[PDB]
């Protein structure tokens, strides 16, 4: 179906995606910040922390060009997306019911692209891209 890049695409816009949700109210936020002066954040209800991370990747896919670099802190989101790509049309593959709909809409957007670089970085303190989208999605959701 597809195969992602092992290194980021030189020259392409980078999307620092992030998502945050509250367990008690199920309210959440998902968005991104880019290295070309672009940002977005959406408010979500009846969501989970894993659902907000996948939604942030979906927003970066629909708002980017044919070549996109995406930096997430989500090992689940990177894992469940990469495993879907590596195990399509294979024998021992079974789709997880956990967020089956949301991941399916991401794969449909992934195929429409020509070059996608998905990488995981740990959530860190600083002034970099992951730290800016961090404060945007956590505002009013969790204490940082
Ligand atoms: C970092 C820090 O001390 N202060 C900065 C503000 C602050 C305070 C507490 C936080 O918890 C975070 C915080 C984030 O903002 C955030 O976005 C994330 C995490 C965070 O912890 C994760 O932990 C985390 C995240 C994605 C993952 O996929 C995993 C996984 O896949 O396993 C984990 C994991 O926990 O394992 C993730 O996206 C941010
Ligand atoms: Mn995150
Ligand atoms: Mn974060
Ligand atoms: Zn191209
Ligand atoms: Zn950073």
TrEMBL record:
Localization terms from the record: Host cell membrane; Host cytoplasm; Host nucleus; Virion
Name of the featured protein: Gag-Pol polyprotein
Lineage: Viruses, Riboviria, Pararnavirae, Artverviricota, Revtraviricetes
């Amino acid at each position: 179906m597809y195969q992602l890049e092992k290194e980021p695409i030189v020259g392409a816009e980078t999307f620092y995606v992030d998502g945050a949700a509250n367990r008690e109210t199920k309210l959440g936020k998902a968005g991104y910040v880019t290295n070309r002066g672009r940002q977005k954040v959406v408010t979500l209800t009846d969501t989970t922390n894993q659902k907000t991370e996948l939604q942030a990747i979906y927003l970066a896919l629909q708002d980017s060009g044919l070549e996109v670099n995406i930096v997430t802190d989500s090992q689940y989101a990177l894992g469940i997306i990469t495993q879907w790509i590596h195990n399509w049309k294979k024998r021992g593959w079974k789709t997880p019911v956990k967020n089956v709909d949301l991941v399916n809409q991401i794969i449909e957007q992934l195929i429409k692209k020509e070059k996608v670089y998905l990488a995981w970085v740990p959530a860190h303190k600083g002034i970099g891209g992951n730290e800016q989208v961090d404060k945007l999605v956590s505002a009013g959701i969790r204490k940082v």
